[PDB]
From a paper:
A novel enteric T cell superantigen, I2, and its full-length gene product pfiT, are encoded by a microbial gene associated with Crohn's disease (CD). Crystal structure of pfiT at high resolution revealed that pfiT belongs to the bacterial transcription factor family of tetracycline repressor (TetR). We show that pfiT specifically and directly interacts with class II MHC HLA-DR, and to a lesser extent HLA-DP or HLA-DQ, and show that pfiT shares an overlapping binding site on HLA-DR1 with other superantigens.
VAST search indicated that pfiT belongs to the TetR-family transcription regulators. TetR proteins function as a dimer to bind their DNA elements. Our structural study indicated that the structures of both pfiT and MAM are completely helical, although pfiT displays a different folding pattern. We speculate that the distinct folding patterns might yield differences in molecular contacts that could account for the divergent MHC fine specificities of these two SAgs. The distinct structure of pfiT relative to other SAgs suggests that it represents a novel family of SAg.
Residue numbers in the entry:
A (entry chain A), B (entry chain A): 11 to 198
């Protein structure tokens, strides 16, 4: 969405308030004061506060995915396409994608069933990009195992990096992504 | 420890009470009634209730590790030794190792710093078995990447299986372990 539209100002500013204070502690008053409007005008753009949270999360995933596809477009070989997705995912895991991603992770349980189903639809599209690229890898002979299960293991291996990557000290994210590629591909 | 010794009866029975009710809700009275003793006699064997929790967790790890080493002893090839550790870890992740493992995972924050350092010492030994076996694999030419980082990714990939393995329906744990082996080894 458009950052200068009042919708965009509201979404982008809500992302910070939610990240800083929590969704539950962020009042409708808080958001209106931050955007320089009155409480009651918030609800000209979203049907509910729950819907603002849904849109913050949708925006983050739309952005991560757009970034992924753009990186893929610049990659012409199997090894570079797999590496592009690994790097994008790691960058998202390590606080790239910013406040609105941190909101997705910690405020997940604040979102309505209906909001959640919308955000999960976007996650489905994100996963299909992974499955396309890993399916290409499998077809070219770079992946030994089942494509869907390979993605499930890689999901866990990359996510877990939050528990240890900072403790390492001298390993960069690019080196981490390269090591992930060495694990998942038979050759690169 | 010895299951028929009063120490063993206490530890093995505490493992259930802690798993069923939580450590915090398990009173000294509860444990004494379950073992058929008086509250005050519990503390002839352990210095504290915190120490009973430490010993439940230590026993589980000692047992998992003993099982690991035994499986390794029956494996004569690199592929079977790596698979043995993957299978043992998965079996532990999926509710093998039983009540005392579930206690380790959920009651971790109830354990004292001193108890924790003891349990972490056992985890160190467990990890060194993984590093030995993966180091053998690397030496024989089966692993492309860094041994320590390969173990960190595999830790995350196996742990994450709790979030999805039941939803699959028809995949067995042995098949899951085989798929993990296909990912981590260049050949098997
Ligand atoms: Mg901003
Ligand atoms: Mg028992």
């Amino acid at each position: 969405t458009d950052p200068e539209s009042a919708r965009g100002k509201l979404l982008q500013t809500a992302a910070h308030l939610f990240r800083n204070k929590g969704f539950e502690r962020t009042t409708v008053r808080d958001l209106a004061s931050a955007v320089g409007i009155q409480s009651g005008s918030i609800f000209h753009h979203f049907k509910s506060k729950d819907e603002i949270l849904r849109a913050v999360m949708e925006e983050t995933i739309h952005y991560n995915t757009a970034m992924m596809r753009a990186s893929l477009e610049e990659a012409s070989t199997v090894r570079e396409r797999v590496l592009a997705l690994i790097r994008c995912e790691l960058q998202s895991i390590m606080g790239g994608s910013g406040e609105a991603m941190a909101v997705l992770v910690y405020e997940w349980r604040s979102l309505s069933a209906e909001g959640q189903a919308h955000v999960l639809a976007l996650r489905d599209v994100y996963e299909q990009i992974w499955l396309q690229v890993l399916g290409e890898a499998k077809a070219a002979g770079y992946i030994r195992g089942d494509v869907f299960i390979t993605r499930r293991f890689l999901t866990g291996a990359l996510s877990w990096t939050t528990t240890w990557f900072r403790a390492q000290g001298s390993l960069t994210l690019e080196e981490l992504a390269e090591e992930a590629l060495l694990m998942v591909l038979k050759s690169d």
